Amino acid sequence: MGKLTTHILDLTCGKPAANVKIGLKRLGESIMKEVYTNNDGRVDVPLLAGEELMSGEYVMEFHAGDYFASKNAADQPFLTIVTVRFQLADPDAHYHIPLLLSPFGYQVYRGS
Amino acid sequence: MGKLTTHILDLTCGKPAANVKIGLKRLGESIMKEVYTNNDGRVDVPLLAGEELMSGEYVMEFHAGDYFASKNAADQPFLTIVTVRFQLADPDAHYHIPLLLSPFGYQVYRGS
Amino acid sequence: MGKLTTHILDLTCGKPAANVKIGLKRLGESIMKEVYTNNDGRVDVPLLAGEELMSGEYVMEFHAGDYFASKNAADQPFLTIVTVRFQLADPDAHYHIPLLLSPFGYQVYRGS
Amino acid sequence: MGKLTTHILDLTCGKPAANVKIGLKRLGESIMKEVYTNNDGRVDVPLLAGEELMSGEYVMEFHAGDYFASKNAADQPFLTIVTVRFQLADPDAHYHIPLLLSPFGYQVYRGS
Numbered sequence: 381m382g383k384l385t386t387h388i389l390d391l392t393c394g395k396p397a398a399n400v401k402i403g404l405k406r407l408g409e410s411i412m413k414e415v416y417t418n419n420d421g422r423v424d425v426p427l428l429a430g431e432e433l434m435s436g437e438y439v440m441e442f443h444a445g446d447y448f449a450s451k452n453a454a455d456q457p458f459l460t461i462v463t464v465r466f467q468l469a470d471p472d473a474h475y476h477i478p479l480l481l482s483p484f485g486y487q488v489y490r491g492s
Numbered sequence: 493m494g495k496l497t498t499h500i501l502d503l504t505c506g507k508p509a510a511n512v513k514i515g516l517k518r519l520g521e522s523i524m525k526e527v528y529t530n531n532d533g534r535v536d537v538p539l540l541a542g543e544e545l546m547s548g549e550y551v552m553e554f555h556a557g558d559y560f561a562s563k564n565a566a567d568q569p570f571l572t573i574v575t576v577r578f579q580l581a582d583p584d585a586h587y588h589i590p591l592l593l594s595p596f597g598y599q600v601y602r603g604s
Numbered sequence: 605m606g607k608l609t610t611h612i613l614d615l616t617c618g619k620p621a622a623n624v625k626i627g628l629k630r631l632g633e634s635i636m637k638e639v640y641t642n643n644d645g646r647v648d649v650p651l652l653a654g655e656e657l658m659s660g661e662y663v664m665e666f667h668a669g670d671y672f673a674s675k676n677a678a679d680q681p682f683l684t685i686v687t688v689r690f691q692l693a694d695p696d697a698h699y700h701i702p703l704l705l706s707p708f709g710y711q712v713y714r715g716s
Numbered sequence: 717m718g719k720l721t722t723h724i725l726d727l728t729c730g731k732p733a734a735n736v737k738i739g740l741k742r743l744g745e746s747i748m749k750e751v752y753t754n755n756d757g758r759v760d761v762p763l764l765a766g767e768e769l770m771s772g773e774y775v776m777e778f779h780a781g782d783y784f785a786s787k788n789a790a791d792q793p794f795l796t797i798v799t800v801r802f803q804l805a806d807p808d809a810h811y812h813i814p815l816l817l818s819p820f821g822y823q824v825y826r827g828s
Contacts, residue, residue, distance in 0.1 A: 387716070389713060389714075389715055389716060389821075391713060391714075391727070391818040391819065391820050391821035392728060392818060392819060392820070393819065393820065394713075394714035394794060394819065394820030394821075395716070396716040420716055421716060435568070437572060439575065445579075454581060455581075456547070456579055456581035457579060457581075458578055458579055458581070458602060458730060459577075459578055459579070460549060460577065460578075460579050461577050462577065463551065463575045463576065463577040464575065465571075465572065465573050465574065465575040466570055466571055466572075467557075467568055467569060467570055467571070467572050469566060469567075469568035469569075469570070480711065480713055480821060482727040482728060482818045482821075483727065483728060483729065483730065484601060484602040484727050484728070484729065484730030485599065485600060485601030485602060485725075485727035485730075485816060485818075486599070486600055486601075487597065487598070487599045487600075487704065487711055487823065488597060488598055488599075488600075489596060489597030489598075489613060489615060489618075489704055490570060490596040490597060490613075490615075490618035491613055492611070492613060492619070492620040492644055492645060499828070501709075501825060501826075501827055501828060503615070503706040503707065503708050503709035503825060503826075504616060504706060504707060504708070505707065505708065506682060506707065506708030506709075506825075506826035507828070508828040532828055533828060570618060592709060592823065592825055594615040594616060594706045594709075595615065595616060595617065595618065596615050596616070596617065596618030597613075597615035597618075597704060597706075599711065599816065599823055601725060601727060601730075601816055602725075602727075602730035603725055604723070604725060604731070604732040604756055604757060659792070661796060663799065669803075678805060679805075680771070680803055680805035681803060681805075682802055682803055682805070682826060683801075683802055683803070684773060684801065684802075684803050685801050686801065687775065687799045687800065687801040688799065689795075689796065689797050689798065689799040690794055690795055690796075691781075691792055691793060691794055691795070691796050693790060693791075693792035693793075693794070708825060708826040709823065709824060709825030709826060710823070710824055710825075711821065711822070711823045711824075712821060712822055712823075712824075713820060713821030713822075714794060714820040714821060
């Protein structure tokens with residue numbers, strides 16, 4: 381009954397980051413899912429839920445470079461893929477892990 | 493003549509994070525360097541400089557889980573290894589990429 | 605039809621900050637409202653809405669010192685009242701201004 | 717022998733914020749100092765030091781609205797004056813309180 385969700389805010393304009401590609405994958409393995417955020421900078425279905433969600437480490441790859449490119453911007457951006465590693469210990473908990481994005485800085489947190 | 497440096501601040505106590513292990517590696521490759529921060533949460537020599545520093549993507553692995561463990565704390569911490577991917581376009585520039593750390597959230601930025 | 609809301613996350617434990625007192629006031633004036641966050645670190649009714657919400661500057665006073673005290677902590681905390689000034693230009697917009705809190709650092713943003 | 721310093725980073729471009737006006741004042745009182753950051757987003761002399769630095773609360777007013785205006789931008793910016801309240805308990809300590817700035821979000825912390 382666990383759940384893993386995320387949301388992206390573009391601090392450069394104060395609006396959610398729409399159409400940003402996000403990749404999910406277990407630590408060590410390769411991509412298992414690829415999603416694109418909607419207009420509220422979220423995704424309809426949880427990135428992980430039910431059986432899918434198992435205790436262990438994961439990595440989310442936020443394609444920030446592409447997002448900011450479609451908004452402007454260097455040919456070789458400082459931030460290309462924002463990588464976020466974290467561990468989900470409880471398989472039945474609700475994990476909200478938002479991302480606050482700027483061209484040269486970001487904030488990751490266990491939201492509510 | 494380029495340079496890559498970093499520094500860690502523990503927002504939980506307002507002091508620099510001392511003795512935190514940091515791993516550096518080119519995107520795709522495995523670890524190339526392993527360092528431990530001093531008492532000011534920095535390292536004597538730049539993580540990258542001179543020939544070592546070449547245009548491309550890198551990843552720094554901050555061992556936050558171990559750091560907070562030695563300071564407290566769950567057996568399976570939410571944040572184990574804080575992964576930071578970024579691209580260094582100019583081989584002759586000075587890149588300062590600090591990390592502001594908390595048990596359930598962190599901030600990455602291109603400092604000065 | 606405008607709306608102003610906020611939410612507090614305690615990055616020290618990854619849970620919303622419950623029962624934190626928040627003060628609202630127009631720039632220059634004294635407090636106009638005093639609220640305490642619920643268990644999700646939010647408040648039932650918007651801090652501002654309808655006629656109440658008028659174009660101009662405001663200030664929110666998050667009583668962080670008291671919150672962390674009830675959770676531990678210095679007699680004279682570094683952060684006592686986290687002050688957040690901002691301007692609401694459009695009286696009919698929806699403003700979400702969350703606060704990510706830690707004992708020695710915080711993040712303010714125009715969320716969604 | 718205490719010291720209070722600060723530094724501003726513009727996360728929108730990864731460069732320090734130059735020529736930003738900063739106001740200092742004791743809680744309750746009006747401005748006591750007004751400074752403008754140099755090209756490294758800092759100021760030559762500490763904002764507070766020696767006798768000047770006394771245990772108590774202070775407030776720094778970062779004129780972000782003007783800074784971003786000279787860089788672009790709404791006539792009525794969301795962030796006009798970023799207000800930062802904090803308490804200095806020890807008169808002989810070194811307090812570094814940097815600001816990570818973006819148009820719609822900022823991070824305040826007790827740096828090193």
